[PDB]
Amino acid sequence: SAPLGPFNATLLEQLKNDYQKGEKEVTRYIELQEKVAEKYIKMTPLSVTAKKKLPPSKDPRDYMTLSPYWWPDSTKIDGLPYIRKDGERNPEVYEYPERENANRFGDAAYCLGVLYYITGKEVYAKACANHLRTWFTDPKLGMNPNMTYAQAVPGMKKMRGSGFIDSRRFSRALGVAKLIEGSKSWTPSDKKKLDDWATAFCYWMENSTQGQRESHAANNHGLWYEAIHLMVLAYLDRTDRIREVAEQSILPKMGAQIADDGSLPQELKRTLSLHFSTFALEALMEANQITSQIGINLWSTPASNGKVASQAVDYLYPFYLNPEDWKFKQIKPFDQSRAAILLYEAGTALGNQKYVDTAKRIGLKYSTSDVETIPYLVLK
């Protein structure tokens, strides 16, 4: 049975099972995945330190991005302080290399780690370990275990926890490292450094002012904080903390953030309201992949006021069928294919055959190289 981590363990166990049986269809699917994964074996490992403009700590190992919806104010001689245009990404975000590099690393590590679990081939673990060492634990290239300067905003006087949501890009890679333990390439010394990094990152998460603030957020930030938290705790094998987090934080947050009619009012007020309602559900989906590995179903387990996350799925389902019917401010097109993994996950967790049907009818492209769709041959 799969090690505890940020994936649909049932679908991974089934793919590894079929690949080992020599089942034709899965075998061909995995051979395609191996072809996609060759670029990650050849890819040079990325580091948070590959930036010219340093953060106020003057430390190139400190992760730093720009908060995406903040823009220079043209009415100020220096553009300072920035102003907020909700839903409009300031392309200045791409001058911070971490932003896209954390996606490239996360994609590389996740794909290689999953392919190692499924095939057993050492070449995937060796490449995966190379990316992990460099991003996380290397004494010069490794990222400091904090998110102090994530989504900083030029001109802002107070510190914010909002940047912590960036962590989900590399925290999935943190969790997949559990899959390459036991390989020849991931030594006991490697595992200890990663362990120690995750322990220091978990501390910063729970005890820094920014972490505490992010833990109490009223919208999808607070849900994403707990999903990221679960990935860190699951890597650290702290399964009783996962139970406490789900019952003392995730379920209360779900209970407050879902209205009686199943809508998410904190997301309804955004300019990307259909996208942020989905982003909230995406946070629960990824949390649930971990909690359900220790018997906690977050789609059907009620909060203390009896609300269940499936109520939020129900409210959105008609608009996953027709995003044009969405009646709230959505200033950019909504990507309907996001409903596939979402409805499949919610649908199986709930025994809702309509959701699963709709997920397969929406579907994923068989030959897509989007790494988060690797477990989902069932949608292809």
Ligand X SMILES: O=C(O)[C@H]1O[C@@H](O[C@H]2[C@H](O)[C@H](O)[C@H](O[C@H]3[C@H](O)[C@H](O)[C@H](O[C@H]4[C@H](O)[C@H](O)[C@H](O)O[C@@H]4C(=O)O)O[C@@H]3C(=O)O)O[C@@H]2C(=O)O)[C@@H](O)[C@@H](O)[C@@H]1O
Closest separation between CB of residue 70 and a second copy, Å?
17
Nearer to ligand X, 210 or 352 (CB): 210
Using CB under 8 A, which of 22, 25, 44, 75 touches a second copy? Answer: 75
d(CA 213, CA 204): 12
Is residue 331 a contact point for a second copy (CB under 8 A)? Answer: yes
Using CB under 6 A, which of 219, 277, 293, 311 touches ligand X? Answer: 219
| Tokens linked to 301 | 């387990």
Nearer to a second copy, 41 or 350 (CB): 41
What mask, x for binding ligand X by CB under 6 A, covers residues 256 to 295? --------------------x--x----------------
Span near a second copy by CB under 8 A; candidates 92-100, 165-173, 187-195, 318-326: 92-100
Is residue 103 a contact point for a second copy (CB under 8 A)? Answer: no
Longest dimension (CA), the chain: 67
Closest separation between CB of residue 3 and a second copy, Å?
28
33 binds, among ligand X, a second copy, none (CB under 5 to 8 A by kind): none
Is residue 34 a contact point for a second copy (CB under 8 A)? Answer: no
Span near a second copy by CB under 8 A; candidates 72-80, 216-224, 252-260, 315-323: 72-80
12: which residues sit within 8 A by CB, 6+ positions away?
A: 2, 114, 117, 118, 375
Is residue 215 a contact point for ligand X (CB under 6 A)? Answer: no
Q: Tell me the β-bridge partners of 70.
A: 84
Judge residue 146's burial from the number of C-beta atoms within 10 Å of its C-beta, 0-12 exposed, 13-18 middle, 19 or more buried: buried
Burial 151-161 (b: 16+ CB within 10 A, else e): bbbeeeeeebb
Chain positions 146 to 165 lying near ligand X, rule: CB under 6 A, are: 151, 162, 165
Minimal CB distance to ligand X: which residue?
Answer: 68
Judge residue 115's burial from the number of C-beta atoms within 10 Å of its C-beta, 0-12 exposed, 13-18 middle, 19 or more buried: buried
Chain positions 349 to 378 lying near a second copy, rule: CB under 8 A, are: 365-370
What mask, x for binding ligand X by CB under 6 A, covers residues 83 to 102? -x----x-------------
Q: How many chain residues are in contact with ligand X, going by CB under 6 A? A: 13
122 binds, among a second copy, ligand X, none (CB under 5 to 8 A by kind): none
Helix axes 220-235, 273-291, angle to 10 degrees: 20
Nearer to a second copy, 185 or 368 (CB): 368
36 binds, among a second copy, ligand X, none (CB under 5 to 8 A by kind): a second copy
Q: Tell me the β-bridge partners of 149.
A: 64
Q: How many CB atoms lie within 10 A of CB 236?
A: 20
265 binds, among ligand X, a second copy, none (CB under 5 to 8 A by kind): none
Closest separation between CB of residue 367 and a second copy, Å?
4
Alpha carbon distances (Å) from 334 to 6, 136, 310, 320: 25, 34, 21, 9
Chain contacts with a second copy (rule: CB under 8 A): 35-36, 39, 74-79, 88, 91, 94-95, 100, 331-333, 365-370
Question: Under the rule (CB under 6 A), what is the footprint of ligand X?
Answer: 67-69, 84, 89, 151, 162, 165, 219-221, 276, 279
